[PDB]
Design an enzyme around this catalytic site. Sequence first.
Site, PDB file in Angstrom:
ATOM      1  N   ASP A   1      -5.930  14.646   4.692  1.00 26.64           N
ATOM      2  CA  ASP A   1      -5.758  14.405   6.111  1.00 26.64           C
ATOM      3  C   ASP A   1      -4.348  14.814   6.566  1.00 26.64           C
ATOM      4  O   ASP A   1      -3.366  14.254   6.096  1.00 26.64           O
ATOM      5  CB  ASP A   1      -6.012  12.932   6.429  1.00 26.64           C
TER       6      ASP A   1
ATOM      7  N   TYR B   1       3.044  14.920  12.043  1.00 24.09           N
ATOM      8  CA  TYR B   1       3.599  14.319  10.834  1.00 24.09           C
ATOM      9  C   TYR B   1       4.812  15.120  10.299  1.00 24.09           C
ATOM     10  O   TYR B   1       5.483  14.692   9.361  1.00 24.09           O
ATOM     11  CB  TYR B   1       2.517  14.204   9.741  1.00 24.09           C
TER      12      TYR B   1
ATOM     13  N   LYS C   1      -5.051  17.647  13.288  1.00 29.89           N
ATOM     14  CA  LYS C   1      -5.268  16.997  14.575  1.00 29.89           C
ATOM     15  C   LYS C   1      -4.394  17.641  15.651  1.00 29.89           C
ATOM     16  O   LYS C   1      -3.225  17.974  15.397  1.00 29.89           O
ATOM     17  CB  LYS C   1      -4.936  15.497  14.482  1.00 29.89           C
TER      18      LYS C   1
ATOM     19  N   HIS D   1      -6.182  14.052  18.417  1.00 30.39           N
ATOM     20  CA  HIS D   1      -5.469  12.963  17.736  1.00 30.39           C
ATOM     21  C   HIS D   1      -5.543  11.647  18.505  1.00 30.39           C
ATOM     22  O   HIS D   1      -5.730  10.589  17.903  1.00 30.39           O
ATOM     23  CB  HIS D   1      -3.997  13.374  17.523  1.00 30.39           C
TER      24      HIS D   1
HETATM   25  N1  LIG Z   1      -5.592   9.452  13.456  1.00 32.15           N
HETATM   26  C1  LIG Z   1      -4.597   8.577  13.593  1.00 32.15           C
HETATM   27  O1  LIG Z   1      -4.190   8.203  14.685  1.00 32.15           O
HETATM   28  C2  LIG Z   1      -3.981   8.017  12.335  1.00 32.15           C
HETATM   29  C3  LIG Z   1      -3.102   6.941  12.402  1.00 32.15           C
HETATM   30  C4  LIG Z   1      -2.587   6.382  11.241  1.00 32.15           C
HETATM   31  C5  LIG Z   1      -2.947   6.938  10.035  1.00 32.15           C
HETATM   32  N2  LIG Z   1      -3.792   8.039   9.957  1.00 32.15           N
HETATM   33  C6  LIG Z   1      -4.059   8.677   8.656  1.00 32.15           C
HETATM   34  O2  LIG Z   1      -4.444   7.646   7.743  1.00 32.15           O
HETATM   35  C7  LIG Z   1      -3.615   7.789   6.579  1.00 32.15           C
HETATM   36  C8  LIG Z   1      -3.524   6.448   5.874  1.00 32.15           C
HETATM   37  O3  LIG Z   1      -3.033   5.445   6.772  1.00 32.15           O
HETATM   38  P1  LIG Z   1      -1.485   4.974   6.685  1.00 32.15           P
HETATM   39  O4  LIG Z   1      -0.618   6.032   6.147  1.00 32.15           O
HETATM   40  O5  LIG Z   1      -1.160   4.312   7.937  1.00 32.15           O
HETATM   41  O6  LIG Z   1      -1.501   3.819   5.562  1.00 32.15           O
HETATM   42  P2  LIG Z   1      -2.237   3.256   4.269  1.00 32.15           P
HETATM   43  O7  LIG Z   1      -2.889   4.254   3.429  1.00 32.15           O
HETATM   44  O8  LIG Z   1      -2.993   2.094   4.753  1.00 32.15           O
HETATM   45  O9  LIG Z   1      -0.989   2.694   3.447  1.00 32.15           O
HETATM   46  C9  LIG Z   1       0.011   3.567   2.884  1.00 32.15           C
HETATM   47  C10 LIG Z   1       1.062   2.728   2.172  1.00 32.15           C
HETATM   48  O10 LIG Z   1       0.451   2.032   1.084  1.00 32.15           O
HETATM   49  C11 LIG Z   1       1.112   2.314  -0.142  1.00 32.15           C
HETATM   50  N3  LIG Z   1       0.093   2.356  -1.207  1.00 32.15           N
HETATM   51  C12 LIG Z   1      -0.836   3.309  -1.401  1.00 32.15           C
HETATM   52  N4  LIG Z   1      -1.594   3.017  -2.464  1.00 32.15           N
HETATM   53  C13 LIG Z   1      -1.099   1.866  -2.910  1.00 32.15           C
HETATM   54  C14 LIG Z   1      -1.518   1.160  -4.045  1.00 32.15           C
HETATM   55  N5  LIG Z   1      -2.432   1.616  -4.909  1.00 32.15           N
HETATM   56  N6  LIG Z   1      -0.836   0.023  -4.326  1.00 32.15           N
HETATM   57  C15 LIG Z   1       0.176  -0.398  -3.567  1.00 32.15           C
HETATM   58  N7  LIG Z   1       0.568   0.285  -2.494  1.00 32.15           N
HETATM   59  C16 LIG Z   1      -0.044   1.432  -2.145  1.00 32.15           C
HETATM   60  C17 LIG Z   1       1.818   3.622   0.100  1.00 32.15           C
HETATM   61  O11 LIG Z   1       2.982   3.667  -0.691  1.00 32.15           O
HETATM   62  P3  LIG Z   1       3.498   4.978  -1.405  1.00 32.15           P
HETATM   63  O12 LIG Z   1       3.182   6.103  -0.518  1.00 32.15           O
HETATM   64  O13 LIG Z   1       4.910   4.574  -1.444  1.00 32.15           O
HETATM   65  O14 LIG Z   1       2.773   5.003  -2.680  1.00 32.15           O
HETATM   66  C18 LIG Z   1       2.199   3.499   1.546  1.00 32.15           C
HETATM   67  O15 LIG Z   1       3.378   2.730   1.652  1.00 32.15           O
HETATM   68  C19 LIG Z   1      -2.301   8.271   7.137  1.00 32.15           C
HETATM   69  O16 LIG Z   1      -1.423   8.782   6.147  1.00 32.15           O
HETATM   70  C20 LIG Z   1      -2.818   9.358   8.063  1.00 32.15           C
HETATM   71  O17 LIG Z   1      -3.177  10.434   7.186  1.00 32.15           O
HETATM   72  C21 LIG Z   1      -4.305   8.577  11.115  1.00 32.15           C
HETATM   73  O1  LIG Z   2      -0.739   8.619  15.343  1.00 30.97           O
HETATM   74  C1  LIG Z   2      -0.547   8.678  14.107  1.00 30.97           C
HETATM   75  O2  LIG Z   2      -1.285   9.313  13.336  1.00 30.97           O
HETATM   76  C2  LIG Z   2       0.634   7.940  13.517  1.00 30.97           C
HETATM   77  C3  LIG Z   2       1.933   8.255  14.209  1.00 30.97           C
HETATM   78  C4  LIG Z   2       2.588   7.282  14.971  1.00 30.97           C
HETATM   79  C5  LIG Z   2       3.729   7.610  15.743  1.00 30.97           C
HETATM   80  C6  LIG Z   2       4.215   8.925  15.747  1.00 30.97           C
HETATM   81  C7  LIG Z   2       3.565   9.904  14.984  1.00 30.97           C
HETATM   82  C8  LIG Z   2       2.431   9.562  14.224  1.00 30.97           C
END
Ligand SMILES: NC(=O)c1ccc[n+]([C@@H]2O[C@H](COP(=O)([O-])OP(=O)(O)OC[C@H]3O[C@@H](n4cnc5c(N)ncnc54)[C@H](OP(=O)(O)O)[C@@H]3O)[C@@H](O)[C@H]2O)c1
Ligand SMILES: O=C(O)Cc1ccccc1
Length: 314
Positions: A42, A47, A76, A109
Amino acid sequence: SRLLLNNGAKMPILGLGTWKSPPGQVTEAVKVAIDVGYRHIDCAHVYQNENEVGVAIQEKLREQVVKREELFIVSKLWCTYHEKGLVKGACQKTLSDLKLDYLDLYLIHWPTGFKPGKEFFPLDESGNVVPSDTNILDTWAAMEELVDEGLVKAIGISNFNHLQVEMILNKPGLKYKPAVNQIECHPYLTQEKLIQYCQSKGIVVTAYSPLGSPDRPWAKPEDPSLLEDPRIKAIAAKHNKTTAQVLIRFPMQRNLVVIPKSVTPERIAENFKVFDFELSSQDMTTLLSYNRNWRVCALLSCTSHKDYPFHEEF
Ligand SMILES: NC(=O)c1ccc[n+]([C@@H]2O[C@H](COP(=O)([O-])OP(=O)(O)OC[C@H]3O[C@@H](n4cnc5c(N)ncnc54)[C@H](OP(=O)(O)O)[C@@H]3O)[C@@H](O)[C@H]2O)c1
Ligand SMILES: O=C(O)Cc1ccccc1
């Protein structure tokens, strides 16, 4: 393992997220993810790390580890690029950073359009976000031509509420249905209504922030932690799994695609080991009961925007 999209393509149910993955660390993270067996990444222009993601993908392709058809690469369209004439340009920029000639899936997005410019969040003199007068239907028509031109295989949406999804499904001359609605989803925000709505219309749901995004930049110390929830630790201990592995398996058994982010090789590997066990229906129903309607990503600077998604119930 894979879900059928309405364009016929198969989307891998587990992907690697890249929000907050530093440029100096994400190339290594993506290369390890591909070695470990991830086939879905993703991405997003906002980003600020697509170049470095793209270096990892190019390396693994040149190595013969995967062929391009085996990978499912998502990016996105950012809010500052919603007007018709800007959409193709934003997509092409992402294609060159990633060093690909097509995306498997490209998402709007957020439903909110901002004033075009170099700032991702353009502010006025009173400091608030300046909206574009563009709307969702016109942006969707511009996304539809990217499919017609071969730049992307499927198009979808992200953070759309059900009425916004409805608007697209009811658009006169609709040529391509949204393939995916990517939304926040975890045990504190279970999304049962929006999920049941999208699945009934043949839209695949992707759950973001499945672990609760503990590295989100607006985290406070009095905020709930999914990873430290003793009730979730207990379900994990019962299965001889980690709490992260339980939280990743949870959306999978609801027929959601899930995209945990990690730049840590042992966690990337750990997060992959989720196909060899099952949560019982009792575990599932228990995890669903933890809903608090708590959002990590509430886009709080845009709460006055005409297209703010989170005023509606779902
Ligand atoms: N479309 C949107 O608006 C939107 C918004 C938010 C997110 N997203 C996508 O969703 C993805 C995931 O969501 P997110 O990044 O918010 O958070 P997430 O995956 O819920 O959490 C990431 C965090 O968890 C830690 N982590 C991962 N695996 C772990 C494990 N096995 N044990 C302990 N800690 C762990 C990571 O640490 P380390 O990296 O330090 O290992 C990082 O600090 C994003 O990266 C993005 O690609 C999209
Ligand atoms: O929307 C997202 O995916 C997460 C994000 C939050 C604020 C700024 C950039 C990206």
